[PDB]
Amino acid sequence: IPTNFTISVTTEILPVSMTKTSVDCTMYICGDSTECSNLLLQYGSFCTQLNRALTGIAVEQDKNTQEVFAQVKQIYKTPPIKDFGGFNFSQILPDPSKPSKRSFIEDLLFNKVTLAQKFNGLTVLPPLLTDEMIAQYTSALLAGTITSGWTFGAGAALQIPFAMQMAYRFNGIGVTQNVLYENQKLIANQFNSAIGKIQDSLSSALGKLQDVVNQNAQALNTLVKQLSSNFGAISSVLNDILSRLDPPEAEVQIDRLITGRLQSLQTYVTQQLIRAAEIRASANLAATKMSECVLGQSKRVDFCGKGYHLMSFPQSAPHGVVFLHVTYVPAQEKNFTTAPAICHDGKAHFPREGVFVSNGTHWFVTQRNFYEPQIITTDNTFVSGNCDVVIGIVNNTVYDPLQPELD
Amino acid sequence: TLVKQLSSNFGAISSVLNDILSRLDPPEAEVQIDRLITGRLQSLQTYVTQQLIRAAEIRASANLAATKMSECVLGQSKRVDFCGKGYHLMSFPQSAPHGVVFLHVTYVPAQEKNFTTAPAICHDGKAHFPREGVFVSNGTHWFVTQRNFYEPQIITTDNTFVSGNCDVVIGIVNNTVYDPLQPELD
Amino acid sequence: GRDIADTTDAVRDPQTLEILDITPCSFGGVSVITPGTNTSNQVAVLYQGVNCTEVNVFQTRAGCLIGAEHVNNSYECDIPIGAGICASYQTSQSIIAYTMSLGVENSVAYSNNSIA
Ligand SMILES: *[C@@H]1O[C@H](CO)[C@@H](O[C@@H]2O[C@H](CO)[C@@H](O)[C@H](O)[C@H]2NC(C)=O)[C@H](O)[C@H]1NC(C)=O
Ligand SMILES: *[C@@H]1O[C@H](CO)[C@@H](O[C@@H]2O[C@H](CO)[C@@H](O)[C@H](O)[C@H]2NC(C)=O)[C@H](O)[C@H]1NC(C)=O
Ligand SMILES: *[C@@H]1O[C@H](CO)[C@@H](O[C@@H]2O[C@H](CO)[C@@H](O)[C@H](O)[C@H]2NC(C)=O)[C@H](O)[C@H]1NC(C)=O
Ligand SMILES: *[C@@H]1O[C@H](CO)[C@@H](O)[C@H](O)[C@H]1NC(C)=O
Ligand SMILES: *[C@@H]1O[C@H](CO)[C@@H](O)[C@H](O)[C@H]1NC(C)=O
Ligand SMILES: *[C@@H]1O[C@H](CO)[C@@H](O)[C@H](O)[C@H]1NC(C)=O
Ligand SMILES: *[C@@H]1O[C@H](CO)[C@@H](O)[C@H](O)[C@H]1NC(C)=O
Ligand SMILES: *[C@@H]1O[C@H](CO)[C@@H](O)[C@H](O)[C@H]1NC(C)=O
Ligand SMILES: *[C@@H]1O[C@H](CO)[C@@H](O)[C@H](O)[C@H]1NC(C)=O
Ligand SMILES: *[C@@H]1O[C@H](CO)[C@@H](O)[C@H](O)[C@H]1NC(C)=O
Ligand SMILES: *[C@@H]1O[C@H](CO)[C@@H](O)[C@H](O)[C@H]1NC(C)=O
Ligand SMILES: *[C@@H]1O[C@H](CO)[C@@H](O)[C@H](O)[C@H]1NC(C)=O
């Protein structure tokens, strides 16, 4: 049986969306020329499909963020008073002094990630939601969680002190509420220390988002570099061929260049769709994780951080989202002799809620996740059956507190 | 798009294959046929790849629908915001052309009132905690009630359990506990 | 003279023996906003990346938007322009461009001895 506990804080990194890219078929393939455009026209439509695919990808990229973050009906604002039962929500809540409405951890996150081609017909669209709105959304979620609990998600937000909210979470995971109220200072100090450790470790990781950015950067660079290959033509510059050869000869040279560039563009588009599918799956997982761990408690194991889950707070990262799970893990232990049932007068006495333990001389009944021995009484136990059916049963007595009263 | 792609020269002299067959000697028409072969093969490959990519997403959506059908319909789920917004009660399925439509019945509260609370009440120097509710006071008296509906009830020794003494509790107030056994004793 | 993309961008004059630069002319995509063809025939062209100094006028981070007025207020998004701007038709009617509104803001009276 554990006799203590430690509060742990973890982090998880989940990419949400990527860059919205636009590519022009005609300017890339041919450019300023008109003979090349006329030749390309004979290929039916190998531009409309590419434009449609890229526009669909961009719309999906916007939808991922809209689904992940826009989960709150009203933008709550934290009250000025900071009497959160001893807890320190100052490295997470926004600081208006900074030019942006971000917080310390968010600022460390954006400073950690570091993010010509436009002349070739490759352009990058801007995100639909600028980072200020995302910061406002996350601040609203934090304020709702802190000042209301999980009630704000279900309906209208309901105020409640933070101490009783933490007591509700404790009672949810299987530890009676008196444990929190008796050990409030220790838990507050442990949580503050965990937040401090997270902040210190982050300053001095973010591999997922960096790799997501690097993949697109390398893909665009490869697409740009593919424009220099001859593909079997005499020269890789269309103007050079046009000014140096007759149209009847220049046509057959331009055909090979057109085929090569069209093939490269097809490859790039296919890779982009394959990557966007995976990003969509990750964004859906992130939305589910937010809606489950943040807006309420979770009974799923290992879903929201290792250990038993208490509460979580979201943070915003460039092209991603960060969760700070707060968990409850057991601590220093002790051996204990145990027994299934207690035999009193030919009647078994199963424990109503808890276990039967004994250090070697006296028997006690106590909860599973914390150690607080109590005397066996009629309120802790219920009788059922005889003393022969149970495989292992230990003789002892039961207090029955009614007898002293009648004296 | 796949059908309309059949009406392009692709570099040959004509689009329909019959004209190529009739107008030219096959030893010269072989290259003209080869151009159309290449173009149409490329178009078919593009269409097939797009279809596979779309089928993956439809499969994922169908798996999600199956999970929601198995969890919301065949039982009650405690996953927040999964089986509809609000607390979840029960769901019914309906059919649709190439899809499924759910009807989530949800329980949502309204018309809230505010109150004053205390973490615990101590009567004779020992702190009492609520077993399953929360202590609320309307201004003169203290009652214990469940945390999702307002049904005040007089605080007794059956709504509370003692734990230690009322000095460690950061917030504590004074009150009395009914102790129903004593009046019946007399 | 070349660059990372390896395209001729700097040249030396064969006559005067001086250094020049090469830069392709400005270009970008064109996007049109329409409130539908059942209420009006009005539109509002949006140039993707061209600065408004080049070829009503409302310079945005997303690009130049002409044909639509700009207002102080903030309503729910109707047309996803980009960079936190959304246009709409309802203002005797004209297109307007504004900033997104996240939603109504409320503050809950949180005190250490108060419940709801
Ligand atoms: C449970 O563990 C905590 C540590 O988190 C113990 O609290 C520390 O106790 C030592 C010894 O008295 C003090 O020096 C520390 O200041 C305490 N706090 C911390 C944060 O270390 C606590 O004593 C343990 N429980 C029991 C019953 O001993
Ligand atoms: C097992 O725990 C019980 C707790 O009740 C211990 O009982 C105590 O024993 C000492 C020594 O005889 C008495 O002075 C105390 O009054 C007893 N009660 C309490 C609450 O301390 C018992 O000693 C423990 N077993 C062993 C082997 O130490
Ligand atoms: C809080 O609720 C109690 C419920 O008992 C109210 O007390 C009752 O008030 C009415 C009207 O004055 C009396 O007729 C009853 O006899 C009272 N019950 C008692 C004293 O047990 C109390 O007034 C309420 N507080 C308010 C409304 O401020
Ligand atoms: C919270 O911690 C910061 C430093 O981490 C400190 O400056 C601030 O005073 C603390 N707040 C409270 C209420 O103790
Ligand atoms: C419990 O008993 C086992 C068996 O001897 C021992 O290995 C273990 O260390 C004991 N627990 C503690 C906390 O000492
Ligand atoms: C319990 O007591 C009964 C009667 O006193 C006896 O028959 C039985 O063997 C006892 N069991 C143990 C484990 O002492
Ligand atoms: C909270 O309750 C007090 C009385 O207990 C009342 O004066 C105040 O107006 C209430 N605040 C609300 C309902 O926002
Ligand atoms: C609640 O805060 C007030 C300050 O507004 C303080 O006087 C009071 O002691 C606090 N009570 C508890 C139980 O925290
Ligand atoms: C009422 O509560 C106060 C708070 O400490 C305490 O000092 C006082 O003794 C309590 N009343 C009685 C009758 O004990
Ligand atoms: C145009 O759209 C509006 C929007 O509902 C509709 O009321 C109207 O009937 C439509 N007109 C035609 C000719 O379809
Ligand atoms: C457009 O050109 C003007 C004039 O130089 C400049 O002040 C402005 O910043 C430019 N627009 C952008 C978005 O940089
Ligand atoms: C916003 O308000 C300011 C202050 O009067 C005004 O100067 C500006 O023109 C307004 N923006 C509009 C009307 O788009």
PDB file of C-alpha atoms in Angstrom, chain A residues 42-46 49 52-53 60 71 150-151 153-159 161 163-164 168 171 176-178 181-185 255 263 266 269-270 273-274 277 280 288 291-292 295-297 300 303 372 374 379 402 405-406, chain B residues 1 4-5 8-11 35 39 42-43 46 49-50 53 56-57 60 78-82 85-87 107-109 112 114-115 117-120 129-135 147 161-165 168-170 181-182 185:
ATOM      1  CA  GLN A  42      -2.741  19.972 -76.331  1.00  0.00           C
ATOM      2  CA  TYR A  43      -2.376  17.930 -73.115  1.00  0.00           C
ATOM      3  CA  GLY A  44      -6.006  18.470 -72.162  1.00  0.00           C
ATOM      4  CA  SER A  45      -6.329  19.456 -68.514  1.00  0.00           C
ATOM      5  CA  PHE A  46      -3.239  18.759 -66.426  1.00  0.00           C
ATOM      6  CA  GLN A  49      -6.681  18.781 -61.200  1.00  0.00           C
ATOM      7  CA  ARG A  52      -8.147  21.615 -57.237  1.00  0.00           C
ATOM      8  CA  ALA A  53      -5.965  19.257 -55.200  1.00  0.00           C
ATOM      9  CA  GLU A  60      -8.338  21.108 -45.044  1.00  0.00           C
ATOM     10  CA  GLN A  71     -14.101  24.266 -28.897  1.00  0.00           C
ATOM     11  CA  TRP A 150     -15.251  20.646 -16.290  1.00  0.00           C
ATOM     12  CA  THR A 151     -18.714  22.208 -16.014  1.00  0.00           C
ATOM     13  CA  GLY A 153     -17.826  22.404 -21.387  1.00  0.00           C
ATOM     14  CA  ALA A 154     -21.200  20.788 -20.717  1.00  0.00           C
ATOM     15  CA  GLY A 155     -23.152  24.043 -20.496  1.00  0.00           C
ATOM     16  CA  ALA A 156     -23.048  27.452 -18.849  1.00  0.00           C
ATOM     17  CA  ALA A 157     -19.891  28.001 -16.822  1.00  0.00           C
ATOM     18  CA  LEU A 158     -20.246  27.526 -13.065  1.00  0.00           C
ATOM     19  CA  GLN A 159     -17.914  29.078 -10.513  1.00  0.00           C
ATOM     20  CA  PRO A 161     -13.105  27.328  -5.691  1.00  0.00           C
ATOM     21  CA  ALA A 163      -9.499  23.544  -3.730  1.00  0.00           C
ATOM     22  CA  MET A 164     -12.831  21.751  -3.991  1.00  0.00           C
ATOM     23  CA  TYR A 168     -13.435  16.413  -6.846  1.00  0.00           C
ATOM     24  CA  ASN A 171     -12.422  11.638  -5.396  1.00  0.00           C
ATOM     25  CA  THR A 176     -11.130  10.184  -0.518  1.00  0.00           C
ATOM     26  CA  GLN A 177     -11.334  13.961  -0.451  1.00  0.00           C
ATOM     27  CA  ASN A 178      -9.887  14.442   3.046  1.00  0.00           C
ATOM     28  CA  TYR A 181      -7.602  19.085   2.481  1.00  0.00           C
ATOM     29  CA  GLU A 182      -5.146  17.626   4.984  1.00  0.00           C
ATOM     30  CA  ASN A 183      -2.178  17.938   2.602  1.00  0.00           C
ATOM     31  CA  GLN A 184      -2.979  21.078   0.604  1.00  0.00           C
ATOM     32  CA  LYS A 185       0.328  22.900   1.119  1.00  0.00           C
ATOM     33  CA  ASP A 255       7.987  18.477 -75.864  1.00  0.00           C
ATOM     34  CA  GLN A 263       6.058  14.468 -64.361  1.00  0.00           C
ATOM     35  CA  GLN A 266       2.629  15.177 -60.583  1.00  0.00           C
ATOM     36  CA  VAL A 269       1.271  16.772 -55.809  1.00  0.00           C
ATOM     37  CA  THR A 270       0.986  13.083 -54.928  1.00  0.00           C
ATOM     38  CA  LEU A 273      -1.701  14.595 -50.572  1.00  0.00           C
ATOM     39  CA  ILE A 274      -0.070  11.623 -48.842  1.00  0.00           C
ATOM     40  CA  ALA A 277      -3.655  12.728 -44.920  1.00  0.00           C
ATOM     41  CA  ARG A 280      -5.228  15.293 -40.797  1.00  0.00           C
ATOM     42  CA  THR A 288      -9.869  14.327 -29.321  1.00  0.00           C
ATOM     43  CA  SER A 291     -11.659  17.514 -25.705  1.00  0.00           C
ATOM     44  CA  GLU A 292     -11.055  14.580 -23.360  1.00  0.00           C
ATOM     45  CA  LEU A 295     -12.469  19.838 -20.806  1.00  0.00           C
ATOM     46  CA  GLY A 296     -12.896  16.947 -18.366  1.00  0.00           C
ATOM     47  CA  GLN A 297     -11.280  14.053 -16.576  1.00  0.00           C
ATOM     48  CA  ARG A 300      -8.654   5.887 -20.144  1.00  0.00           C
ATOM     49  CA  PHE A 303      -4.212   8.387 -22.737  1.00  0.00           C
ATOM     50  CA  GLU A 372      -5.241   5.260   6.587  1.00  0.00           C
ATOM     51  CA  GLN A 374      -9.421   2.323  10.640  1.00  0.00           C
ATOM     52  CA  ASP A 379     -20.370   0.538   8.856  1.00  0.00           C
ATOM     53  CA  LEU A 402     -24.454   0.462  18.853  1.00  0.00           C
ATOM     54  CA  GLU A 405     -24.673   3.550  23.356  1.00  0.00           C
ATOM     55  CA  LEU A 406     -27.254   1.292  25.018  1.00  0.00           C
TER      56      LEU A 406
ATOM     57  CA  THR B   1     -12.620  14.440 -65.893  1.00  0.00           C
ATOM     58  CA  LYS B   4     -13.351  14.226 -70.893  1.00  0.00           C
ATOM     59  CA  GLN B   5      -9.639  13.373 -71.030  1.00  0.00           C
ATOM     60  CA  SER B   8      -7.009  15.454 -76.510  1.00  0.00           C
ATOM     61  CA  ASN B   9      -4.452  15.123 -79.297  1.00  0.00           C
ATOM     62  CA  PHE B  10      -1.549  14.299 -76.940  1.00  0.00           C
ATOM     63  CA  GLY B  11       0.744  15.249 -79.830  1.00  0.00           C
ATOM     64  CA  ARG B  35       1.342   8.785 -78.184  1.00  0.00           C
ATOM     65  CA  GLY B  39      -1.428   9.804 -72.577  1.00  0.00           C
ATOM     66  CA  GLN B  42      -1.001   8.426 -67.528  1.00  0.00           C
ATOM     67  CA  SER B  43      -4.586   9.622 -67.081  1.00  0.00           C
ATOM     68  CA  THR B  46      -3.735   9.514 -61.975  1.00  0.00           C
ATOM     69  CA  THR B  49      -4.190   6.944 -57.346  1.00  0.00           C
ATOM     70  CA  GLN B  50      -6.722   9.647 -56.485  1.00  0.00           C
ATOM     71  CA  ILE B  53      -6.284   8.179 -51.539  1.00  0.00           C
ATOM     72  CA  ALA B  56      -8.428   5.626 -47.341  1.00  0.00           C
ATOM     73  CA  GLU B  57     -10.278   8.607 -45.851  1.00  0.00           C
ATOM     74  CA  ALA B  60     -11.225   5.967 -41.648  1.00  0.00           C
ATOM     75  CA  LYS B  78     -18.467   8.949 -20.169  1.00  0.00           C
ATOM     76  CA  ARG B  79     -16.092  10.359 -22.801  1.00  0.00           C
ATOM     77  CA  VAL B  80     -16.681  14.115 -22.845  1.00  0.00           C
ATOM     78  CA  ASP B  81     -17.888  15.631 -26.172  1.00  0.00           C
ATOM     79  CA  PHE B  82     -17.729  12.213 -27.867  1.00  0.00           C
ATOM     80  CA  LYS B  85     -22.343  17.983 -26.528  1.00  0.00           C
ATOM     81  CA  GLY B  86     -23.256  17.833 -22.843  1.00  0.00           C
ATOM     82  CA  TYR B  87     -23.769  14.865 -20.581  1.00  0.00           C
ATOM     83  CA  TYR B 107     -28.783  16.183 -20.407  1.00  0.00           C
ATOM     84  CA  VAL B 108     -27.787  19.817 -19.901  1.00  0.00           C
ATOM     85  CA  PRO B 109     -28.490  21.957 -16.809  1.00  0.00           C
ATOM     86  CA  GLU B 112     -28.088  28.247 -11.915  1.00  0.00           C
ATOM     87  CA  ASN B 114     -25.009  30.962  -6.440  1.00  0.00           C
ATOM     88  CA  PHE B 115     -24.261  29.913  -2.867  1.00  0.00           C
ATOM     89  CA  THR B 117     -19.629  26.875   0.637  1.00  0.00           C
ATOM     90  CA  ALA B 118     -17.123  25.477   3.096  1.00  0.00           C
ATOM     91  CA  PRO B 119     -14.702  22.565   2.652  1.00  0.00           C
ATOM     92  CA  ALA B 120     -15.763  21.003   5.978  1.00  0.00           C
ATOM     93  CA  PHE B 129     -16.653  15.885   5.275  1.00  0.00           C
ATOM     94  CA  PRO B 130     -19.580  15.321   2.889  1.00  0.00           C
ATOM     95  CA  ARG B 131     -19.780  11.742   1.667  1.00  0.00           C
ATOM     96  CA  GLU B 132     -21.151  12.437  -1.808  1.00  0.00           C
ATOM     97  CA  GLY B 133     -22.223  16.083  -2.103  1.00  0.00           C
ATOM     98  CA  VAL B 134     -21.106  19.585  -1.141  1.00  0.00           C
ATOM     99  CA  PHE B 135     -21.972  21.882   1.754  1.00  0.00           C
ATOM    100  CA  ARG B 147     -23.395  18.569  -7.007  1.00  0.00           C
ATOM    101  CA  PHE B 161     -17.713  10.989   8.020  1.00  0.00           C
ATOM    102  CA  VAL B 162     -15.202  12.267  10.557  1.00  0.00           C
ATOM    103  CA  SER B 163     -11.472  12.547   9.884  1.00  0.00           C
ATOM    104  CA  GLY B 164      -9.087  13.878  12.515  1.00  0.00           C
ATOM    105  CA  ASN B 165      -9.674  17.319  13.995  1.00  0.00           C
ATOM    106  CA  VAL B 168      -5.398  21.337   9.488  1.00  0.00           C
ATOM    107  CA  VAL B 169      -8.375  22.209   7.220  1.00  0.00           C
ATOM    108  CA  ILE B 170      -7.452  25.548   5.522  1.00  0.00           C
ATOM    109  CA  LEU B 181     -29.923   8.313  17.080  1.00  0.00           C
ATOM    110  CA  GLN B 182     -30.068  10.408  20.260  1.00  0.00           C
ATOM    111  CA  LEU B 185     -32.983   6.921  22.215  1.00  0.00           C
TER     112      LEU B 185
END
